[PDB]
Amino acid sequence: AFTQAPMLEQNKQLPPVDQRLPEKPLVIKPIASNGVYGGTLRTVMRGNADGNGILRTIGPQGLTHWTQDIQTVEPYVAESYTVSPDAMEYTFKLRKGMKWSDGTPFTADDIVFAMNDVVLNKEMFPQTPSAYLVGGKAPKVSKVDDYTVKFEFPAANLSFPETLATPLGQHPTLYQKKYCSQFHPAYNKNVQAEFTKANVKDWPSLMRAKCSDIELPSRWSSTERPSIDPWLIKEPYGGAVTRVVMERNPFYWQVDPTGKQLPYVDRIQYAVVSDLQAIILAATNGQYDIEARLLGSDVTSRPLMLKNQQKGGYKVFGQTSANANAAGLWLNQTTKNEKLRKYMTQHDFRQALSLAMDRDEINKVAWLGQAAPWQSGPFKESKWYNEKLATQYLKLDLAQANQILDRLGLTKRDSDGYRTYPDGGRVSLDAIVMIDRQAMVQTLELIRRQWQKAGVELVIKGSERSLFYNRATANDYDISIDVFPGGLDATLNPRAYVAVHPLESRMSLEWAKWYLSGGKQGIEPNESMKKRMALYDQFVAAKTQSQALSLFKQILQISADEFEVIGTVRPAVISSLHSLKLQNVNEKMPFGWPYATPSLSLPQQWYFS
């Protein structure tokens, strides 16, 4: 019954299609219609550090997968799975006969190797990635037979199936044991010979170079790394390539309802382009069949995109960002500026800084009026909605800001009109920002002038993305501006409400380091933050959905009371485009990294009309 692409008819070494598919392949229901084979999907990456663009184009192929409405997940690579009544035990059934891109078997051996020999190997990952932890506690992972793998957590872990559908939860399917064991000392007695044959000097760097990790550029730099991906790297990503080309995986493990082995589209070609203006011009000319990653957050792109739809042969669809805030102020409560810290740690000082802001002016100038004032909370339709976390201190009230700052003792003025500390110099805050995010830079420039009227100085420190993260983890900043997640994905990314992300919980990464190390590194958080961390552990280890619900709402209320991070606007709509000839794009899908959009729309069932 099963049929294949005409392009694979010419490969005479390939087995017949029913032997390359699993016995029971996953049947993909198309978004709008049954498709036809053929064509090259044209799309775009910006620069040499945009490998996630490939991931978000072809899609993470994890054990589970989001529904189109992102409310729940379904078995994906797993045929099915069970969960014990206590929710500590997850048993995954794999698809018998499934194969890697090189024709060799996909079995529990691969999942057990990826878990035990890579993810949970402490030489490879000194800090075990959090996706596979419950409150810091690791699972025991074992093979029950060739097509059954068991995960045993020391505590209840209701979120694990949702984790397995995010990009960061795809390790279990990322490593073929046979190829990857060559580069692992527990398997290759002569792993030293491979170190020389590469530019490395230890087995963890060897693994990263040859087998890679979720977000490493090495994931897309070679054709020989096996995968279960719908398309395989053919012309690879590299430090200075002008293009990337990917070709259908002849051993892909999915069919459409009529029995066609997917994908429909034969090839994907990514143009690798440096300056954003060339991407805008190429997109508005209709040279890309899909662009749902790069322009949509740039609000000045939208009028251009809409105007050229007919000219360029494309349709713009607007996506709903999952982030609660498009450009939020993370205030560092462990700032190294001692004089500043005595005010940073005071609730009412943070309240003043929010009251001295004009979110209508920010929306007008930097977001072309397409956003709306908001702080850090989930949106109204979320069951997590908290009004205070969303809407406190949104209206400009400069007279109240100035009264508060006076009450705090910041009444002495310097020769330039700024407030000073009672003992010290000018009230001045350093804010780090990625210079490429022009809207965020412009937001800070507007905040600087707004806060100038309260006698507060904002110093803007733009930088490359690399130095921006080095300053953060070095604890060398007072404010860092970036998105607040949580509008739609609060329990997937609670980092704005509790300091649990080591790179992004920038109310203090030192507090985050304390959480992640069980108190042995970092700086001890304040009582309200420790309280939220203990409740967070209870939340992730909750035994029922109703216990989880109460515990996470407690965390959100304490976050609202503390008011540690200051939102500017919730995001404007995210403007994406697809070629009019490209069928089966879910134009209603939300936008977000936890869903790896646009690949949430199942690009293996896109086709050309």
Residue numbers in the entry: 2 to 610
What does the paper say about this structure?
SPH1118 has been identified as a pectin-binding protein involved in both pectin chemotaxis and assimilation. SPH1118 shows high homology with the solute-binding protein (SBP) associated with the bacterial ABC transporter. SPH1118 consisted of two domains with a large cleft between the domains and substrates bound to positively charged and aromatic residues in the cleft through hydrogen bond and stacking interactions. Here we show tertiary structures of SPH1118 with six different conformations as determined by X-ray crystallography.
Interestingly, SPH1118 showed three conformations [SPH1118 (open form), SPH1118 (full open form), and SPH1118 (closed form)] even in the substrate-free state. The crystallization conditions of SPH1118 (open form), SPH1118 (full open form), and SPH1118 (closed form) contained the substrates (ΔtriGalUA or sodium PG). However, no substrates were bound to SPH1118 in these structures. The crystal structures of SPH1118 (full open form) and SPH1118 (closed form) were obtained only under crystallization conditions in the presence of sodium PG. Two molecules were included in the asymmetric unit of the crystals of SPH1118 (closed form) and SPH1118/ΔtriGalUA. Root mean square deviations (RMSDs) between two monomers in the same crystals were calculated, respectively, indicating that there were few structural differences [SPH1118 (closed form), 0.543 Å; SPH1118/ΔtriGalUA, 0.106 Å]. Compared to the C terminal domain of SPH1118 (full open form), those of SPH1118 (open form) and SPH1118 (closed form) were closed by 18.9° and 34.2°, respectively, suggesting that the domain of SPH1118 was flexibly opened and closed even in the substrate-free state. There are a few examples of proteins whose domains are closed in the substrate-free state, as observed in SPH1118 (closed form). There is little structural difference between the closed forms in the substrate-free state and the substrate-bound state. Further studies are necessary to elucidate the physiological significance of SBPs adopting the closed conformation in the absence of the substrate.
